[PDB]
Design a binder for this molecule. Sequence first.
Ligand SMILES: [Zn+2]
Ligand SMILES: [Zn+2]
Lengths: 472, 49, 320, 308, 121
Amino acid sequence: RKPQNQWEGVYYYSGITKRQRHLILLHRKREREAHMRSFNISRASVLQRLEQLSGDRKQESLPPHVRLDLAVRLAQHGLYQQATPIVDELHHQKALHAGHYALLINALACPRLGQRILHCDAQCDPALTYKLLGDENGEERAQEAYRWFDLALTSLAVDCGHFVPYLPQGTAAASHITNALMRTLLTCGYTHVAAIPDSVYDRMGSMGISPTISTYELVMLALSLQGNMVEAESILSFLRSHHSEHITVESFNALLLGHREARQFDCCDAIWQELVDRRWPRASPLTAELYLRSIMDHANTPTSEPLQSFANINVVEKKKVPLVLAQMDELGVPRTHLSRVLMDEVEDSLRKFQTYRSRFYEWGRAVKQFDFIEFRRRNGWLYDLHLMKGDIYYDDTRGLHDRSPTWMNEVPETRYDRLYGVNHPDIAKIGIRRHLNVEYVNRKEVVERDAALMKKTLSSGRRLRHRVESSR
Amino acid sequence: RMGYIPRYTPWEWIAIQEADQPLIAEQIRQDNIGTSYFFSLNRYWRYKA
Amino acid sequence: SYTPNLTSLTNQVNRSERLRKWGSAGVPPGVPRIPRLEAKGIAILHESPKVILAGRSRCNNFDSNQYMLINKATKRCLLVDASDDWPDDWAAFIGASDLTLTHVFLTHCHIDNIINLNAFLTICGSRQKQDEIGVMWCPAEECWVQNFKRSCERYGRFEEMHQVLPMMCRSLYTPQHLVDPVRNARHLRRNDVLLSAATNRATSFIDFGNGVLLYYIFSPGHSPGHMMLHIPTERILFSGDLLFFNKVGRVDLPWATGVRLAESLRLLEALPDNTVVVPGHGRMTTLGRERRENKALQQCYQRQEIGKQEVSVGFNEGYL
Amino acid sequence: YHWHYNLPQGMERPHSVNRTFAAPFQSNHSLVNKYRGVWIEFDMHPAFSVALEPQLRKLPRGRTLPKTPAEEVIADYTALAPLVDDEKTRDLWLAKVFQHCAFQRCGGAMELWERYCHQRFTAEGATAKPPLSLVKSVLFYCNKTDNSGWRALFDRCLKDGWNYTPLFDTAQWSFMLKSIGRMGDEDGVRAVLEEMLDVQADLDRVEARSVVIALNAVTNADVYEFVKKYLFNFGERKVKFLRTTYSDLRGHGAGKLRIPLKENDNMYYHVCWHSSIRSPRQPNAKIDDIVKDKIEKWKAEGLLPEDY
Amino acid sequence: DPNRVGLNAATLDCRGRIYRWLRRGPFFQVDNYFRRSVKLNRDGTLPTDFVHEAPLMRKIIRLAHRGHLKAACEEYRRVTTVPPVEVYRALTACCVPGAKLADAVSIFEDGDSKLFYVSRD
Ligand SMILES: [Zn+2]
Ligand SMILES: [Zn+2]
């Protein structure tokens, strides 16, 4: 029988229909419309709230907390220009305090516009949200964040009016506003996220403000977005040496994000395996999102030294996805807290690399194998990548023939059968009888039949020799 | 060379053979709750012990 | 069989006829080599004071036969249709009998005749090292030596595919190679005989030595060039594929004419009945037995008597 | 021919067949966990659900069908539904009794549509838009009891109307086509099948007993030629299964249907012709002047003589 | 329908049916007996409503409400049809006063994917 290929994989169904990929694209466009509809309804509500309190309260002065509540809601929805006359009169009336300034600068980073950018524009990539928030007035919001920081430190000197030459730089309010400044500057452009570890951090050191754990995590996230990993791991190495009790999850989230931008996928594996090992701080769904997206960027990355001679090699990195999802079940990370863009690619890796025991008993049936061949024969133009087009270290002088008796042990049956007539002058050296040298099962019976054929041929040849010359 | 047959399969050829065949989900064998002392041997008759 | 063109791949009956003949495999199993088991020895068929006929029956899985004429005086041997699955006994037989292999006679150039011809000239040519062996054949078989590689693909003889035939090499009847002046084992074969279709009883013979003449007879119909061997002094007729025991050759192969085969059966009616006809397949018979109890010869003359102008006789089930 | 044992037994070349060909899951058996029914999408606010909880108890919930007779839940909506002052609560409650009267086949539940919802949705160019759960429940009801009121509602779901046809499931079209073939509307079959092709519905996954009923009621000549070009839109696996189901529903398995089919043999012979086609093998003015010039010649030749 | 309950089998007549019997999977008798039996109905409801094993379902709920977990697990092994939602509600309520989480998950995992999502409640 013709042999079957043992290095050919079993035919199994790993893929989706053209209707299903269209229906995934159609359903994902509906919820992108739903988040676009949800933002503009609430944006129009805060703009109607602004014009109501400006028109009907034209001469009646509002209480300062209502104007403070509307100023943070304007800044959260990306409307920074409608909020700066509100904060300028609240600072002039001296109604703002230490916590109020940190509330306004944290609102200036717009955590309502970033929610629309995440679900609709950035395709649920948490690294791309910082890259896309910098375009909607990134330099303009950074100047007002620097201006409100100068408004804050001027107010803190009034609010602190012993430790008198070391106020307000030694208080908790100075670092809280400085942590609010670095959080707002991360949402700005590339010129301002580069100024966080260099310009803002040295200004905090020159002012003598003691940092906190949220200070270092935003600096590590700022160095993560630049792509500088030799400095980002050094800050956590300072935190691993000195302040190890206060390390939260966001330092690990910066390093998982940072090696994803630098495309060092071997490093981001070791950070995830470290977080599974220590199990403290707890793995957020942002940890599972940043690590699984680094797998998919590594899986869709083409290689160029074999130049894809047979297939894509990096697609084997999606086999780790059932291992990571099994680790999320024990870490307490719910897999339903994953984004819709990532969950389609996670289930893409699951139907390609996962099988159950009930399916493994039925996946090799000849009916399913021959359906795979006919479906490749009928429509292979729709789903194909090709159709689109002693001890040796102390040995040096070896001791040979150490009188080890091979006659105490018994291996007596090593008889070998060679072909008849090797040195015979009548038998030729080359011939088709040379193929008898490669035969193992019938080695004894073939060469004794071959010797009996060659002995009778040389006997009949030499008896024909003696008959012809004796007759003439 | 004229007859070079490698005695080690290359890293590209190993990665192709691993990427073509799927994994079995019961090979992870993780367990954190414990053994069902009352129900696991008395489950439904098709998938029973 | 033939070249798989576009209409042969898009035909359903090509996929259906390959299911009927060979079952679920669809590929025809070839004609393999006979192993060193189930193989017999070389027999001495005839001994005469002039020549000696030594033969071997069923030397291929085509059930072909291998014969050799041994001249007693000149010590010169001659192979007829050199196709043996083991041409190593034949080299040892001529080496132990002090014989000189000078020529190889070929009746026709089917795969039952020239499958091991390069093996015959290499093994027997190596023994004379411690004048080369000639090939006697008819140039009408040029169409069958071009399709020798096609016949080896269908019958599974892959080891003899990539072998240039020695009769295809440059002989004395061909223009010579103009090699660079800065090797004639394969460039020139001086010992080569091309037989002519104008075969008569006067001059169309081979002088085998000591006064025996091998009259070659052109008798097509099974093949374009089919040269029998007739020894009138010894009553021996090597018919090849023309006449067997109670049957004749096939016509259902290319370049095989049924009306040419009937004319080939009529040109042996002047030979006596005790002429022992020695076919290429099966058992040997006499020409008088085939004139009495062969239905192919009986149908050939019955159609001739009732007035058929183009008498067409021939087999469709038998030997190649 | 083989591989010898003293040779190195390495892999000759790797084979990536499962990554070059990504095959979707195709089984001849149907899915054992599918709902095989019309979903209502009950999305009530969680304050009226616990308030109307003794009234919603006798109503069909998710994968649960209570056997309360339909005349009691009609009387519950007759009295208690004017008490609740919420528009979408009464519409979602009315969708459940329309679903409850469909499963028990109560033909008198169409009075509830004319009582409450006809005047504000389907009367005299109403600009109000009904919810999707209400349109799905009344179209499933009118198809179950073979009511003729589906035509005014199906015309409202077009692209200029309510535009609810991209929100219909594949099981909604299966119950739709079964009722039109039972009542025998030739233009009702064509207007739905043109809508299903315009909406890009799953044509290969409609119920096969539903298609062969809607195709059996095709008797008009112009819509019969529409079926001939529409039959190529199905798959080759689907069109060979439409032949086997239509041959059994008119043959031995005629008792599976509630009412028997009518004998339409010109649709039967065309489906048997179309299934065999998809399966593998196993100038009048110028011509009339030619003939009149010949008869003119034959009278001159004498071949066509006069009276003797 | 109580009188139409029962499944008839074949006789393995021809040689081609013997070769299919020798080429069947590991679960061919128990799988085809499970699919010829109870399945999801035309209206979409469960096959829970079975007449012949109805008081057996009353026995398990009677055993799981009194705290007899092991006896309720023993009578659950005797079922052939799809059990109702009320037995899974009673079995998981029997595991809570003893904090038996491993038994309660295996009760849910039996009816989650294998028995048409009757325990997903
Ligand atoms: Zn021949
Ligand atoms: Zn022959």
